[PDB]
Design an enzyme around this catalytic site. Structure first.
Site, PDB file in Angstrom:
ATOM      1  N   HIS A   1       0.746  -1.259   0.000  1.00 17.93           N
ATOM      2  CA  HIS A   1       0.000   0.000   0.000  1.00 17.93           C
ATOM      3  C   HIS A   1       0.778   1.312   0.000  1.00 17.93           C
ATOM      4  CE1 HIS A   1      -4.532   0.818   0.999  1.00 17.93           C
ATOM      5  NE2 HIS A   1      -4.148   1.377  -0.134  1.00 17.93           N
TER       6      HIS A   1
ATOM      7  N   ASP B   1      -9.899  -0.530   3.948  1.00 28.27           N
ATOM      8  CA  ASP B   1      -8.739  -1.118   4.607  1.00 28.27           C
ATOM      9  C   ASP B   1      -9.114  -1.470   6.043  1.00 28.27           C
ATOM     10  OD1 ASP B   1      -6.058  -1.610   5.568  1.00 28.27           O
ATOM     11  OD2 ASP B   1      -5.313  -0.112   4.139  1.00 28.27           O
TER      12      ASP B   1
ATOM     13  N   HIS C   1      -6.914  -0.825   8.214  1.00 27.90           N
ATOM     14  CA  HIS C   1      -6.122   0.229   8.833  1.00 27.90           C
ATOM     15  C   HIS C   1      -6.346   1.560   8.126  1.00 27.90           C
ATOM     16  CE1 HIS C   1      -4.234  -3.706   8.287  1.00 27.90           C
ATOM     17  NE2 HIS C   1      -4.050  -3.664   9.595  1.00 27.90           N
TER      18      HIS C   1
ATOM     19  N   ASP D   1      -3.718   3.680   7.641  1.00 28.55           N
ATOM     20  CA  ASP D   1      -2.445   3.957   6.974  1.00 28.55           C
ATOM     21  C   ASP D   1      -2.138   5.441   6.932  1.00 28.55           C
ATOM     22  OD1 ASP D   1      -2.305   1.237   6.470  1.00 28.55           O
ATOM     23  OD2 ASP D   1      -3.088   1.452   4.417  1.00 28.55           O
TER      24      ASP D   1
ATOM     25  N   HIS E   1       4.054   1.271   4.271  1.00 24.48           N
ATOM     26  CA  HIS E   1       2.734   0.910   3.759  1.00 24.48           C
ATOM     27  C   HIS E   1       1.674   1.235   4.807  1.00 24.48           C
ATOM     28  CE1 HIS E   1       2.307  -3.435   5.592  1.00 24.48           C
ATOM     29  NE2 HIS E   1       2.827  -2.581   6.455  1.00 24.48           N
TER      30      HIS E   1
ATOM     31  N   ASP F   1      -7.493  -2.141  -0.130  1.00 26.09           N
ATOM     32  CA  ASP F   1      -6.478  -2.983   0.496  1.00 26.09           C
ATOM     33  C   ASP F   1      -7.253  -4.272   0.708  1.00 26.09           C
ATOM     34  OD1 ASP F   1      -4.871  -4.448   2.276  1.00 26.09           O
ATOM     35  OD2 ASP F   1      -4.235  -2.637   3.361  1.00 26.09           O
TER      36      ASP F   1
ATOM     37  N   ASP G   1      -6.744  -6.600   2.781  1.00 25.68           N
ATOM     38  CA  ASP G   1      -6.873  -6.973   4.183  1.00 25.68           C
ATOM     39  C   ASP G   1      -8.058  -6.238   4.800  1.00 25.68           C
ATOM     40  OD1 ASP G   1      -4.175  -4.898   5.604  1.00 25.68           O
ATOM     41  OD2 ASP G   1      -6.302  -4.431   5.330  1.00 25.68           O
TER      42      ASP G   1
ATOM     43  N   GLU H   1      -1.971  -5.162  -1.401  1.00 28.51           N
ATOM     44  CA  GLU H   1      -1.602  -6.113  -0.356  1.00 28.51           C
ATOM     45  C   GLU H   1      -1.840  -7.605  -0.582  1.00 28.51           C
ATOM     46  OE1 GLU H   1       0.424  -5.078   1.646  1.00 28.51           O
ATOM     47  OE2 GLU H   1       0.066  -2.997   2.188  1.00 28.51           O
TER      48      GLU H   1
END
Ligand SMILES: N[C@@H](CCCC[NH3+])C(=O)O
Ligand SMILES: N[C@@H](CCCC[NH3+])C(=O)O
Ligand SMILES: N[C@@H](CCCC[NH3+])C(=O)O
Ligand SMILES: [Mn+2]
Ligand SMILES: [Mn+2]
Ligand SMILES: [Mn+2]
Ligand SMILES: [Mn+2]
Ligand SMILES: [Mn+2]
Ligand SMILES: [Mn+2]
Lengths: 313, 313, 313
Positions: B96, B119, B121, B123, B136, B227, B229, B272
């Site tokens: 990312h 995501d 997260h 980030d 990332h 992303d 994840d 990712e």
């Protein structure tokens, strides 16, 4: 908030023994450290010593009534203690029969408490309606005042006094309710959100109605009795009485995140975690990992993040 | 719509290397053919050549700042190219950190773009708030103008210019946000829907609010940085930083089907996907299969069906 | 209510044979006993004898048209019989081509019926739009009156008479619809809730709209054709044409619990259970267990509990 941890390694409320290990694995997962890793003042009152009561023959159909009645009596005093200490009691079980002592002891320092019962079952069978005889499926019947008269004098509970009304409690997650239990639900007008209502309204509306129902008239201390079999067995498999179609991990956390935000949480129960029932070591950690996640949520851990009252930039 | 595919085999934004294979497996799954199997004019700009930068010592805590800064710079120009070609840029990562170049390059031809960040997260760590040092987990901090001043001159990013405001972006799916990140979120007033809000409102209302929030005042090009994840690890396990309790496969597709229908999608990031992290070959195909499904949705593939403007009867 | 069970071991509507075992495993799971364990007057009309039709060459692209046409004709008469007996027909399949006879036979005693089709597919291809030639993906095209003219005289169906309008049916759970099928959906204005609409509105609103749509103008008998591949393959894997991103176990039960409560259920189809397709004996029991659960819901089994009109205290 300010926590008071108490271990309750008890299993005599049901057949499968490995449930008395709950405290051990929940602590090994590092629960204390995790809690402390937050705005939590943690004091572990250790594990209660549940002395052997070798002579405990069934009362009619009811099994181990004395050891159960004793284990709950001992816990009630311990919970009352931690509450008198101005701390949120966190009882790690142990089978669900212990709720009898946890809630009773809580009601002593806070007689106006409100109860939220997350479980796949209602655990409201009476010594007379139960077919299994397992006391971890009758805890609720001993606490309701409206059922004061349908509860026979079972050895070990003459210390018990019904401490909650049929309207001071809300069930969430029901999906395996006996006939006599369903009858009692509709008869006493108990508020519940089975899996059918969760699917219908969505977990958000469910909680909204729950908190509004118990806090509508006025703010009162809250007692959350969380049975891990309340969540789907794909998240908490290491438990004695699992039922498919349970609450998801997310709904599990949403319930607790919401309760936490009320700021009225005063009593918490994490029950039925049985490591011996894991089919693999992973189902075991998966169960305990999940049981820990739901506990940390109760005390602040939010999925959107957390930060201290400081300037990080 | 009219697509411009660009492969970005980069991994230096984090520790686990197998992420630079993303382009390879995503193409092997037959992504191009699939896209073409629709109302898609597909032109693959090939895989960007991310030349070795052997001398890239950490900048304080930040790792591989030069190779990262370089990889993003190269991508920015490539994305700007495909956009100037009147094509929806589809960047296959790669970790990312690349979002920095993708979004920057997009903002060059379309400075008024709006960003949707799916995501687990945010980030948004800064070179100063990050504890891991992995870039990332900081892409967002380099793009926000309001954070122009809290970003030190890190080798490899002197070409960077904050191109988006705190209100031009909406996060969806958050469930593991650092303390400094949460602080930044509340401080800049960033719009987000963590997993708590998804559970509360439902994925439908979530998107409704998102699209309305970013397109309310007026229609603008949209950039979707996805992303993998972001979705629950039961769907996309082969990724570096998985977190349980993620968005379901369905919610994954609902987000993209909705974005597609806006007709404003102009930039897309599929990040990712790390095949080396699959525990089995199935977790690998399960991750890539899912990553492909979400991509085809972005360009028209609807679950209710599709048909050409002709009479099938 | 009062049930009339009929086994339909048929597989010639598609390639994979083990589907004709559905009746056997569904009964071995103890379906009859379970039903009887409720307010159900159960009468099993046994398994229909689907005599061999050795000479059944394809009609153009359509495979086994005669054995299929025959199997549906035989079932139609059997369903009409059980209905004339004042019983809710419960047809255990068997592939979905049988719906043609089930619904036709139902429409004979109750021409005003309403149909609810739970499936991952619409099964509305015509002998002319189908690309596979498998009749278990065309049952709907033979029943709609508006398609009376686009259905060629296929050997084995000259007994067929379109018995339902485009507005007497509601699809729920769609996620893999062919192009010609989608065209027909939009052309005849068929009401459907693909997985996109379920994600958007929630399963509760979905059913609310469905029941309101079919019962709005006036109460009519209901026919529920449940294809097990309608639910996600993580619940019903042992089926021929599985598609990820399906209806959950919970949504599966919510649909049936709601239909049950209407009190208008008159015809029920449990199709596509193929034990031979289970990858393990568990996927097999998991599929049949789930198929049984959804059936018991149709006839009263509620997740909040059940109890007889008596005083349990
Ligand atoms: N309701 C059943 C099951 C209870 C399960 C409790 N963990 C009973 O009364 O035995
Ligand atoms: N927020 C953490 C995790 C980021 C994970 C990115 N894929 C960090 O700053 O390192
Ligand atoms: N719609 C496809 C798949 C049908 C699957 C039916 N179980 C066809 O017409 O063959
Ligand atoms: Mn339980
Ligand atoms: Mn319980
Ligand atoms: Mn992430
Ligand atoms: Mn990311
Ligand atoms: Mn189907
Ligand atoms: Mn079907």
């Amino acid at each position: 908030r300010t926590i008071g941890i108490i271990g309750a390694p008890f299993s005599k409320g049901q057949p499968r023994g490995g449930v008395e290990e709950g405290p051990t694995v929940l602590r090994k997962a590092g629960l204390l450290e995790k809690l402390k890793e937050q705005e939590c003042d943690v004091k572990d009152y250790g594990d209660l010593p549940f002395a052997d009561i070798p002579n405990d023959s069934p009362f009619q159909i009811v099994k181990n009534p004395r050891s159960v009645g004793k284990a709950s009596e001992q816990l009630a005093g311990k919970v009352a203690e931690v509450k008198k200490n101005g701390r949120i009691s966190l009882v790690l079980g142990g089978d669900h029969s212990l709720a009898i002592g946890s809630i009773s002891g809580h009601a002593r320092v806070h007689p106006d408490l409100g109860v939220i019962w997350v479980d796949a079952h209602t655990d409201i069978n009476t010594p007379l309606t139960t077919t299994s005889g397992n006391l971890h499926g009758q805890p609720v019947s001993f606490l309701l005042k409206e059922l004061k008269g349908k509860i026979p004098d079972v050895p070990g509970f003459s210390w018990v006094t019904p401490c909650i009304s049929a309207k001071d409690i809300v069930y969430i997650g029901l999906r395996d309710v006996d006939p006599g239990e369903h009858y009692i639900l509709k008869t006493l007008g108990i508020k519940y959100f089975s899996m059918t209502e969760v699917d219908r309204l969505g977990i958000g509306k469910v909680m909204e109605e729950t908190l509004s129902y118990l806090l509508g008239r006025k703010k009162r201390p809250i007692h959350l009795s969380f049975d891990v079999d309340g969540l789907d067995p794909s998240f908490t498999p290491a438990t004695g009485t699992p039922v498919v179609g349970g609450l998801t991990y997310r709904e599990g956390l949403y319930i607790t995140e919401e309760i936490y935000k009320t700021g009225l949480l005063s009593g918490l129960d994490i029950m039925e975690v049985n490591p011996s029932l894991g089919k693999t070591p992973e189902e075991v950690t998966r169960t305990v990992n999940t049981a820990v996640a739901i506990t940390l949520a109760c005390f602040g851990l939010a999925r959107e993040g957390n930060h201290k009252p400081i300037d990080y930039l």
